[PDB]
Amino acid sequence: SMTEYKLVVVGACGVGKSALTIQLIQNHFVDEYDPTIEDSYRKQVVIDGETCLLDILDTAGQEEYSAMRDQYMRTGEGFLCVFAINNTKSFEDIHHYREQIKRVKDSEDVPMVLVGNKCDLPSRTVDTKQAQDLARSYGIPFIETSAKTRQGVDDAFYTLVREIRKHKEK
Amino acid sequence: MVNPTVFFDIAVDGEPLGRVSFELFADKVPKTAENFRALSTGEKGFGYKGSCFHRIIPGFMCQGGDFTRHNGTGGKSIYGEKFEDENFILKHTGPGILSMANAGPNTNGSQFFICTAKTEWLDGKHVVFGKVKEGMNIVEAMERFGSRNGKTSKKITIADCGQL
Ligand SMILES: Nc1nc2c(ncn2[C@@H]2O[C@H](COP(=O)(O)OP(=O)(O)NP(=O)(O)O)[C@@H](O)[C@H]2O)c(=O)[nH]1
Numbered sequence: 288s289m290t291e292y293k294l295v296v297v298g299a300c301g302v303g304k305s306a307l308t309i310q311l312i313q314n315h316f317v318d319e320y321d322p323t324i325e326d327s328y329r330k331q332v333v334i335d336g337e338t339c340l341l342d343i344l345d346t347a348g349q350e351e352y353s354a355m356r357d358q359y360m361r362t363g364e365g366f367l368c369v370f371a372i373n374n375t376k377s378f379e380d381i382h383h384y385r386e387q388i389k390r391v392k393d394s395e396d397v398p399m400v401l402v403g404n405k406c407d408l409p410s411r412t413v414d415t416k417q418a419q420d421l422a423r424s425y426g427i428p429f430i431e432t433s434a435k436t437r438q439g440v441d442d443a444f445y446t447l448v449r450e451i452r453k454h455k456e457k
Numbered sequence: 458m459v460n461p462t463v464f465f466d467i468a469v470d471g472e473p474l475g476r477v478s479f480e481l482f483a484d485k486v487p488k489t490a491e492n493f494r495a496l497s498t499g500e501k502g503f504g505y506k507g508s509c510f511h512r513i514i515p516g517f518m519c520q521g522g523d524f525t526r527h528n529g530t531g532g533k534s535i536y537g538e539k540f541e542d543e544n545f546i547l548k549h550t551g552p553g554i555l556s557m558a559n560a561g562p563n564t565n566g567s568q569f570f571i572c573t574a575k576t577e578w579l580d581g582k583h584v585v586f587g588k589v590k591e592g593m594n595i596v597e598a599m600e601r602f603g604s605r606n607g608k609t610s611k612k613i614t615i616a617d618c619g620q621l
Pocket residue numbers: 298299300301302303304305306307317318319320321322323324346347348349404405406407408432433434435436
């Protein structure tokens with residue numbers, strides 16, 4: 288038998304939410320930026336020997352439509368909170384996403400993974416240590432990724448599945 | 458002086474769909490109206506002719522105007538890459554309103570949208586500068602080609618444009 292997981296990818300504009308998702312789903316990367324409105328994907332994978340059906344909601348990096356975004360958070364089971372390692376504002380934005388998710392789901396324990404993307408680039412402004420410390424303060428995993436090279440992509444999504452599984456089986 | 462009128466001849470995969478004309482509110486939003494007017498005539502050497510309505514979401518709007526990157530990310534004004542929000546005098550009161558797309562405050566370029574419904578939550582964030590004069594039925598017909606994420610099922614282009 289299989290298990291299904293509702294994953295939601297959030298983060299500021301341009302950090303790589305869609306590139307990460309497309310690498311996971313389709314195993315390719317393109318440097319062309321196509322700004323997201325909303326897209327949803329389904330993929331079957333094996334994680335820890337178990338068959339998993341991943342439902343991925345790829346959200347836009349806008350903050351205006353709170354009614355819709357709150358519904359994304361109510362329905363979603365786990366959140367990939369993405370920032371880009373060469374975009375300090377995107378890292379500063381992370382705490383807003385965590386606060387919104389906790390508020391909407393009325394919980395201090397929501398499955399989530401902090402993702403620092405674009406680690407292939409030579410223009411880093413956010414130290415790995417700073418992101419590690421933030422994730423520790425939240426009690427959540429931190430994973431550095433590159434959608435371009437595929438580094439960490441499977442690890443980020445699979446770790447999120449593991450966080451949902453642990454939360455549901457507590 | 459009288460508010461200028463401009464037209465777009467809309468095509469679907471190259472076949473004529475119809476003409477949409479706009480009144481540009483130069484009397485209230487002169488700098489923003491002038492940008493759209495000049496981009497419609499092509500008189501600066503660049504502009505809307507040939508470009509695409511790349512994002513059409515039924516129930517909301519038809520958005521176009523990227524003649525530089527041709528992928529929904531680009532565009533430029535006659536004043537430079539970007540210009541400031543001129544005023545927020547006019548509101549998104551219903552179908553046919555013509556308003557500037559942007560990427561945040563003071564980032565107007567060439568991208569624009571035509572409302573197909575009242576979009577009042579955009580008030581104070583996007584500069585309204587015109588309205589459809591003739592051809593709202595053409596705008597309504599363009600909606601058939603949109604979708605919930607804005608991707609279009611055929612190529613919707615400004616095959617010709619200019620000033621009346
Ligand atoms: N070098 C590099 N570029 C990346 C990486 N991830 C994304 N990009 C690039 O960054 C740009 C934005 O990526 P995209 O996935 O569209 O970002 P997004 O967070 O989905 N944006 P939006 O909020 O508009 O939907 C694109 O040009 C893309 O190629 C990465 O790991 N490395």
